[PDB]
């Protein structure tokens, strides 16, 4: 009995939560209360299974049960139904932006019913983030609960809560985006791509770890994510705990940076492990040359065990390169692979695969130079203007892309600047390029829902590893027809005056996207000249005797 097994392994609380999450991700549009009803029925049922694993319906898969419950798609049978539920996950669901009500209202609701409030949190995130790393969402719910527990008792409920909630929202969106890439990686590119990812990350993270260890953690982590991305949240959370549990029983085989996370309560622990600092690279590790370029058996060993050897390479290269983005290490490993694929078949492989690392230069240089160039641009512009720059860039690159998406991605793109450009070069590239993988992936998923740009589609369906160079390589499509100057898109409301800094940025940014859409191939100064026109008009209308009409007159 799986639902019992999981209920047992997860405990009711996390079971409930994961089931809610699973429901809210399966039925994003469905009301909270219909989800909790389903969850309770499932939980109630799970309990009957914990008690007798032979009770009538307890041997059914989690898929059948959730899907059966969900069905209270639905016309379909398993496993086509679960596939159906998964494919209907909506990365951009038509759901009201979660509008934070005032703290006292929230704090009242939180105290009115903590679980319901906490379940409401899960539900609202999960349904908005249908790929949200479900166990991680439990961690968020815990922190959300902790926020509300403490901050609701605070003198300044808002001043306590808001920053914390802002942190969790941000962390949430980051985690969602992040997990979204795992699911996209897994689902669009397959297990191997994810495995490659994981070998690269974990090798970087756990360079002291033996390859077999990195592999074991990779197979387990992959299994975690496959399950999570597959809406198998229960297995996923459970396998995650198992993985956290494994890692923590095996820290000395994995990382010396694990001390603190492995002491951490279950949810914190996995979260902690998932983002532990890269471990110290083992001292005096040799170059990959003897094994991967220099050996005469390279061709043989690749061929004998391709993915292992490539994994060993990726492991060996990644563990040596926490200063490389995962995608880079992935690119290098793909390059290695493909070079070996041609060298091994070439007249003298030893000869030509000895040169394999020379192909690595451009691959390594490109992100570096990109990260360096764009981060100077960032340091010149700061996050916001860096966002405006990228927003224009991307709008010009892929103008068909919905502006909200454009804005969101560009903003996020620009956020990598803030996150990464602060870092010295040694931490910039993994930070930047991997966050870039996350953000582009956003662009990718957001756009996929309503594809309107063949370039985005192209760049997103192509090698995940190469997704970023692909967008980077994109230049202005002139095959894009500017949109006529709709007033409504450039006639902001007086609500702009009341907008938070961020929201007024999103708005200028939105205008900036639209303006670029209205008139692409306009240069930065001309774009600046209407952006400044807009902001002035806004400044004017915002301080006008009557705002709403001042605004109307544009
Ligand atoms: O070079 S690639 O990244 O394209 C790659 F071939 F997929 C590879 F990453 F090297 C890889 F070998 F496939 C791998 F990603 F490492 C791997 F598939 F994960 C793997 F290492 F082979 C593995 F599947 F995990 C295995 F090692 F077999 F356990
Ligand atoms: O080259 S692109 O503009 O297409 C890009 F992929 F978005 C990008 F170059 F990575 C970029 F987003 F523009 C970018 F500026 F490089 C970046 F992604 F934001 C970035 F390079 F990561 C950055 F933000 F500049 C970074 F410097 F990495 F922080």
Swiss-Prot record:
Binding site for Ca(2+) 2: 9, 238, 242
Site note Not glycated, residues: 16, 37, 60, 69, 76, 89, 119, 142, 157, 164, 173, 178, 188, 195, 223, 245, 257, 269, 342, 355, 372, 385, 397, 415, 419, 449, 458, 483, 502, 507, 521, 524, 540, 543, 547
Phosphothreonine PTM sites in chain numbering: 403, 405
Residues modified to N6-succinyllysine: 188, 419, 502, 547
Tissue: Plasma.
Albumin domain location: 1-169, 170-362, 363-554
Effect of residue 296 to N: In Canterbury/New Guinea/Tagliacozzo/Cuneo/Cooperstown
Binding site for Zn(2+): 63, 230, 232
GO biological process: cellular response to calcium ion starvation; cellular response to starvation; negative regulation of mitochondrial depolarization
Main location per the UniProt record: secreted
UniProt-annotated glycosylation sites, renumbered to this chain: 8, 47, 120, 145, 182, 208, 216, 259, 264, 296, 300-301, 306, 334, 361, 396, 422, 427, 477, 508, 517, 519, 528
Binding residues for (4Z,15Z)-bilirubin IXalpha: 223
Binding-site list for Ca(2+) 1: 2, 227, 232, 235
Disulfide-linked positions: 49-58, 71-74, 73-84, 107-152, 151-160, 183-229, 228-236, 248-262, 261-272, 299-344, 343-352, 375-421, 420-431, 444-460, 459-470, 497-542, 541-550
Residue numbers carrying N6-methyllysine: 517
Outcome, altering residue 63 to A: Impairs metal binding
PTM remark: Glycated in diabetic patients. Phosphorylated by FAM20C in the extracellular medium.
Annotated compartments: Secreted
Keyword Zinc appears in the UniProt entry: yes
Any GO molecular function: fatty acid binding
Keyword terms: Calcium, Cleavage on pair of basic residues, Copper, Disease variant, Disulfide bond, Glycation, Glycoprotein, Lipid-binding, Metal-binding, Methylation, Phosphoprotein, Repeat, Secreted, Signal, Zinc
Task performed by this protein: Binds water, Ca(2+), Na(+), K(+), fatty acids, hormones, bilirubin and drugs. Its main function is the regulation of the colloidal osmotic pressure of blood. Major zinc transporter in plasma, typically binds about 80% of all plasma zinc. Major calcium and magnesium transporter in plasma, binds approximately 45% of circulating calcium and magnesium in plasma. Potentially has more than two calcium-binding sites and might additionally bind calcium in a non-specific manner.
Membership in a protein family: Belongs to the ALB/AFP/VDB family.
Disease: Hyperthyroxinemia, familial dysalbuminemic: A disorder characterized by abnormally elevated levels of total serum thyroxine (T4) in euthyroid patients. It is due to abnormal serum albumin that binds T4 with enhanced affinity.
Protein name: Albumin
Source organism of this protein record: Homo sapiens
């Amino acid at each position: 009995s799986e639902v019992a097994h999981r209920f047992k392994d997860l405990g009711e609380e996390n079971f409930k939560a994961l089931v809610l999450i699973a429901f809210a991700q399966y039925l994003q549009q469905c009301p909270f209360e219909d989800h909790v009803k389903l969850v309770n029925e499932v939980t109630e049922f799970a309990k009957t299974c914990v008690a007798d694993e032979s009770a009538e319906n307890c041997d059914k898969s989690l898929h059948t049960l959730f899907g059966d419950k969900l069905c209270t798609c639905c016309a379909k049978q398993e496993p086509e139904r679960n596939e159906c539920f998964l494919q209907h996950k909506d990365d951009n669901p038509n759901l009201p932006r979660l509008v934070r009500p005032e703290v006292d209202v929230m704090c009242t609701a939180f105290h009115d019913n903590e679980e319901t409030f906490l379940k409401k949190y899960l539900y609202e995130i999960a349904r908005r983030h249908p790929y949200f790393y479900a166990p991680e969402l439990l961690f968020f719910a815990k922190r959300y609960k902790a926020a509300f527990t403490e901050c609701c008792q605070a003198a300044d409920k808002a001043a306590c809560l808001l920053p914390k909630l802002d942190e969790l929202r941000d962390e949430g969106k980051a985690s969602s985006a992040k997990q979204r890439l795992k699911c996209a990686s897994l689902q669009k590119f397959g297990e191997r791509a994810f495995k490659a990812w994981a070998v690269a990350r974990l090798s970087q993270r756990f360079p002291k770890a033996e390859f077999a260890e990195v592999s074991k953690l990779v197979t387990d982590l992959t299994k975690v994510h496959t399950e999570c991305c597959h809406g198998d949240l229960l297995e996923c959370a459970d396998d995650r705990a198992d993985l956290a549990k494994y890692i923590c029983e095996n820290q000395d085989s994995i990382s010396s940076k694990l001390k603190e996370c492995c002491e951490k309560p279950l949810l914190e622990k996995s979260h902690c492990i998932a983002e532990v600092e890269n471990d110290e690279m083992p001292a005096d590790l040799p170059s990959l040359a003897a094994d991967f370029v220099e050996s005469k058996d390279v061709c043989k060993n690749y061929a004998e065990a391709k993915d292992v050897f490539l994994g060993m390479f990726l492991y060996e290269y990644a563990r040596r390169h926490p200063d490389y983005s995962v995608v880079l290490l992935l690119r290098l490993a793909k390059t290695y692979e493909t070079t070996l694929e041609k060298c091994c078949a070439a007249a003298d492989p030893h000869e030509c695969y000895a040169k394999v690392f020379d192909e690595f230069k451009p691959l390594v240089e490109e992100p570096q130079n990109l990260i360096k160039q764009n981060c100077e641009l960032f340091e010149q512009l700061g996050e916001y203007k860096f966002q405006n720059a990228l927003l224009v860039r991307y709008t010009k690159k892929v103008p068909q892309v919905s502006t909200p998406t454009l804005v969101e991605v560009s903003r996020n793109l620009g956020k990598v600047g803030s996150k990464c450009c602060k870092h010295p070069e040694a931490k910039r590239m993994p930070c930047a390029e991997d966050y870039l993988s996350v953000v582009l992936n956003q662009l990718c998923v957001l756009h996929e829902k309503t594809p309107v740009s063949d370039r985005v589609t192209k760049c997103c369906t192509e090698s995940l590893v190469n997704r970023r160079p692909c967008f980077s390589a994109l230049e202005v499509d002139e095959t894009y027809v500017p949109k006529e100057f709709n007033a409504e898109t450039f006639t902001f409301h007086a609500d702009i005056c009341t907008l938070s800094e961020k929201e007024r940025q999103i708005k200028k940014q939105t205008a900036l996207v639209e303006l670029v859409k209205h008139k692409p191939k306009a240069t930065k100064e001309q774009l600046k000249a209407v952006m400044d026109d807009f902001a002035a008009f806004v400044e004017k209308c915002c301080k006008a005797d009557d705002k709403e009409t001042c605004f109307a007159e544009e």
